[PDB]
């Protein structure tokens, strides 16, 4: 052949979001989170027009419960923690 390439459409796609030590609490990094990552909905893909970039039209805030596992203490601490996940619902190629 080879088979012609199909452009990656500007649309919502299942992505993996890493639950980072920085965003929720900034006290230090030496605390582990469970689960370490979760699935999210994001805008990914390309635009046919040059000038344009793929962008979210509207987002949805989704809170989830995780656990903070503090290691650098006299004893282990397994604390509940809420993390706000940003999900994209619609994507469109926008003028810039």
């Amino acid at each position, epitope marked *: 052949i080879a088979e012609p390439a199909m452009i990656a459409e500007c649309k919502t796609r299942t992505e993996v979001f890493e639950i980072s030590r920085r965003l929720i609490d900034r006290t230090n990094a030496n605390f*582990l989170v*469970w689960p370490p990552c979760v699935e999210v909905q994001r805008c990914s893909g390309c635009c046919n027009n040059r000038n344009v970039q793929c962008r979210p039209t509207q987002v949805q805030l989704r809170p989830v419960q995780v*656990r903070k*596992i503090e*290691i650098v*203490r*006299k*004893k*282990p*601490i*397994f*604390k*509940k923690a809420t993390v706000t996940l940003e999900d994209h619902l619609a994507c469109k190629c926008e003028t810039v």
Partner: antibody
Amino acid sequence: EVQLVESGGGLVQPGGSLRLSCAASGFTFSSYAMSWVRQAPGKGLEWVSYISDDGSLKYYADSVKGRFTISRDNSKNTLYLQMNSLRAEDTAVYYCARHPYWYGGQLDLWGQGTLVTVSS
Amino acid sequence: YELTQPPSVSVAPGQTARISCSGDSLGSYFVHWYQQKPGQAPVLVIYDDSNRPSGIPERFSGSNSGNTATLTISGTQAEDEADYYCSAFTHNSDVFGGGTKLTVLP
């Protein structure tokens, strides 16, 4: 059949030392975090020490800090507790217990316990 | 500090036993419950506030919110007579509560 068996308990003098052992069987001992929990006669449960699945992280209660040492031999499927500078208040039944998850503090499996009496 | 439990709870057979456990911001931590019969090792009856391990009867249920965790035993039988210990790994030095002895009337 999943099991934990403590040994090494006995009568000991104050300021003396004792090493406790805990033999694990029926499961992969290396994949689990472990704790020592003690119970004075007629009294309640007191967490003593915690050890990571690999032995990297070791935690102690303030009542045993500087005197007790936790360790493990994953090749032998054995948990250890080295108790030095023993005091009458250290008299208890010593339990060996398994944390089913690295991210959890609950205790899945317990041994039958080993009695340590500290007296002059 | 300390995880506070009533030293004893008395109930009539078939009634609902409620054993409390109090600690500073306890609701923001995971609470486990252990059942201990004389001469026996503790048994995990509830983990992570409300979860029952396999082999634990439906009678046992738990909750944790705010400052207090509660163990609930509906349809209390003679075989439920034991010492109950709450447990949590928090910022305070005590991993276990003082215990509650559950007794069945008369």
